């Protein structure tokens, strides 16, 4: 159809624009400690601590995959990092202060990714 076709340039429009906002929050992460998935070879029982981890190159293949429906599923997404961070991790630890910057300077940019996706539609 005509429609789902209308659809597919919206969902690939909003893809490009979280593409963007992805992009954004990962210079928030220099030190790219949130880069990649917690290595299982290295955190053997990481998965006993932490049920659904996440990491940035892990919400790209799910962005390249147009996997992302809606801004909310993304943010969902970017708070597990941080979150599963600030558990795992003692308050005294660079890991921890990294989640903690990471989530003030992004909330900003999600701020503003909020109002034009609403206002884009």
């Given at each position: 159809s005509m429609e789902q076709v209308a659809m597919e340039l919206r969902l690939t429009e909003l893809t490009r624009l979280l593409r963007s906002v992805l992009d954004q929050l990962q210079d928030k992460d220099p030190a790219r400690i949130?880069?990649?998935?917690?290595s299982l070879k290295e955190v053997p029982d990481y998965l006993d601590h932490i049920k659904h981890p996440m990491d940035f190159a892990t919400m790209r293949k799910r962005l390249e995959a147009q996997g992302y429906k809606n801004l909310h599923e993304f943010e969902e997404d970017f708070d597990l990092i941080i979150d599963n961070c600030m558990k795992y991790n003692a308050r005294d630890t660079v890991f921890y202060r990294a989640a903690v910057r990471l989530r003030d300077q992004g909330g900003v940019v999600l701020r503003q990714a909020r109002r034009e996706v609403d206002s884009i539609g």
């Open positions: 949130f880069a990649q998935p917690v």
